């Protein structure tokens, strides 16, 4: 692979640690900042498995290239560097120590600390803000879900896996046992049309995830029945601990007509206003 001095980190500056998932490992980067050479930064490192193919390799390269082009934002997982020469490819990104948003929410359900109502709307605001940034860079996520929102040590929401490329198996489940089709806009599901508007649909489901503290959409509903519910214009029930305003936001994101859904810019503005007016006293 060609070297890119914008992003290259010498392999001996990266102390590999425990696995995070399967491939991703936790690591320590020494002197990530050229300006700051004696500091260690915890980072996440993506790499290929021992059984990887040329196609596997080409995908990793493309995710890394897309991240360079998209640029930095507080509410996405940012590229921090790469080891590309003389050894396996390592793509180094920001580490999110409190896991994904689903996990983060579930672990804070009533019997870590509790989340106020302000906190929950703030999560939504941050994700909307991340997505508005990505939209502005012409990036379409195609699988926006709480599982692909990671949470940092300082509780910042960061959108992950935005830079991946897509081929899709509707019956394939996530490691946690859920079906990705349950976040897909109908035009994306039925006509394989993916847009910013179809991501906004997904964001509506994500909002539902947040206000159910990590609830699972359509529990017990298989793919074939999900199709029928969508064709009949079915819409998930309003969560308890959810204002009428936020529920109408969900329903708007779920407009049958893609052009009538709000944009991410509009959602960021509305959520901004709602955060300020939402109590943190419970």
């Amino acid at each position: 692979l060609p070297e890119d001095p914008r992003w290259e980190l010498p392999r001996d500056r990266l102390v590999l640690g425990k696995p995070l998932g399967e491939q991703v490992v936790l690591a320590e980067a020494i002197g990530l900042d050229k300006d700051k050479p004696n500091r260690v930064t915890k980072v996440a490192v993506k790499m290929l498995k021992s059984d990887a193919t040329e196609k596997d390799l080409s995908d990793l390269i493309s995710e890394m290239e897309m991240m360079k082009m998209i640029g930095k934002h507080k509410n996405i997982i940012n590229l921090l560097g790469a080891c590309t020469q003389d050894g396996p490819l390592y793509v180094i990104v920001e580490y999110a120590s409190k896991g994904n948003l689903r996990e983060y929410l579930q672990a804070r359900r009533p019997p870590e600390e509790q989340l106020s109502s302000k906190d929950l709307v703030s999560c939504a605001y941050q994700v909307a803000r991340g997505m508005e940034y990505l939209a502005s860079k012409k990036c379409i996520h195609r699988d926006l879900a709480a599982r692909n929102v990671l949470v940092t040590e300082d509780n910042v929401m960061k959108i992950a896996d935005f830079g991946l490329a897509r081929d899709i198996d509707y019956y394939k489940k996530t490691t946690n046992g859920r079906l990705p089709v349950k976040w897909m806009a109908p035009e994306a599901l039925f006509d394989r049309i993916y847009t910013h508007q179809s991501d906004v649909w997904s964001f509506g489901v994500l909002l539902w995830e947040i206000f159910t503290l990590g609830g699972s959409p359509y529990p017990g509903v298989p793919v074939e029945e999900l199709f029928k519910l969508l064709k009949e214009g079915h819409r998930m029930d309003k969560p308890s601990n959810c204002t009428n305003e936020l529920y109408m936001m969900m329903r708007d994101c779920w407009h049958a007509v893609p052009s009538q859904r709000p944009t991410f810019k509009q959602l960021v503005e509305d959520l901004d206003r709602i955060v300020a007016l939402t109590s943190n006293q419970e």
Side-chain angles (χ1 to χ4, degrees), residues 2-17 19-21 23-33 37-38 40-48 52-53 56-65 67-71 73-111 115-165 169-171 173-191 193-223 225-227 229-230 232-282:
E3 196 198 342
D4 183 350
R6 296 178 297 180
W7 295 103
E8 192 74 22
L9 178 80
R11 300 190 174 265
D12 68 352
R13 302 296 72 195
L14 194 61
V15 179
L16 303 181
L20 287 165
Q23 170 189 7
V24 181
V25 303
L26 175 62
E28 275 159 314
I30 301 175
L32 207 40
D33 321 324
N38 298 310
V40 299
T41 303
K42 294 181 168 60
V43 298
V45 177
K46 189 179 275 183
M47 67 182 67
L48 301 166
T53 74
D56 289 317
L57 176 56
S58 172
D59 289 348
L60 183 58
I61 290 169
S62 198
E63 176 177 3
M64 176 183 58
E65 290 306 307
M67 296 182 72
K68 296 168 180 186
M69 196 135 300
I70 275 169
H73 191 272
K74 190 180 185 199
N75 299 118
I76 69 180
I77 289 298
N78 296 292
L79 182 69
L80 298 171
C83 307
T84 68
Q85 299 305 300
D86 309 304
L89 175 54
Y90 295 161
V91 182
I92 308 161
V93 300
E94 287 170 330
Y95 171 61
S97 63
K98 295 181 164 177
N100 69 47
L101 177 56
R102 176 191 49 86
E103 297 169 323
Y104 174 86
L105 292 172
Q106 281 177 355
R108 287 159 181 75
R109 290 173 164 189
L115 297 167
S116 83
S117 283
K118 202 178 203 66
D119 293 334
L120 296 177
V121 186
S122 168
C123 294
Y125 169 76
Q126 286 172 68
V127 172
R129 205 152 180 226
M131 286 303 304
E132 166 186 42
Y133 177 74
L134 292 170
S136 81
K137 299 296 173 180
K138 325 295 168 70
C139 175
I140 296 165
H141 195 294
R142 299 181 172 88
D143 190 26
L144 178 66
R147 61 179 168 269
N148 291 321
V149 175
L150 301 180
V151 182
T152 69
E153 176 56 40
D154 296 321
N155 300 328
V156 176
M157 310 289 122
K158 292 174 164 294
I159 295 154
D161 283 4
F162 52 89
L164 297 172
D169 187 21
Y170 292 166
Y171 296 84
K173 300 182 166 192
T174 67
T175 85
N176 195 33
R178 305 178 181 170
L179 298 160
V181 284
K182 287 169 175 176
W183 285 257
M184 296 193 186
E187 69 275 12
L189 191 60
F190 299 127
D191 311 334
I193 296 175
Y194 286 93
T195 61
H196 301 303
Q197 288 133 338
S198 62
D199 274 353
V200 163
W201 177 288
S202 296
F203 181 77
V205 184
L206 197 150
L207 285 174
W208 189 91
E209 288 185 275
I210 285 173
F211 291 103
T212 53
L213 312 183
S216 174
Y218 292 124
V221 175
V223 170
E225 299 289 340
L226 169 64
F227 293 168
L229 295 176
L230 290 178
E232 292 162 2
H234 188 273
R235 298 292 185 266
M236 285 186 308
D237 293 336
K238 178 176 162 189
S240 57
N241 190 30
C242 177
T243 65
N244 291 317
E245 193 174 26
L246 289 168
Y247 184 52
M248 294 288 89
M249 178 177 289
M250 294 182 198
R251 304 290 307 259
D252 289 344
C253 294
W254 296 331
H255 213 292
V257 186
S259 70
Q260 299 302 293
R261 297 170 199 155
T263 59
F264 279 114
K265 177 182 180 180
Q266 185 63 57
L267 291 162
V268 167
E269 287 178 13
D270 290 337
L271 283 167
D272 189 33
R273 169 182 55 82
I274 296 171
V275 164
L277 299 182
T278 310
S279 165
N280 50 10
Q281 294 307 274
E282 82 185 76

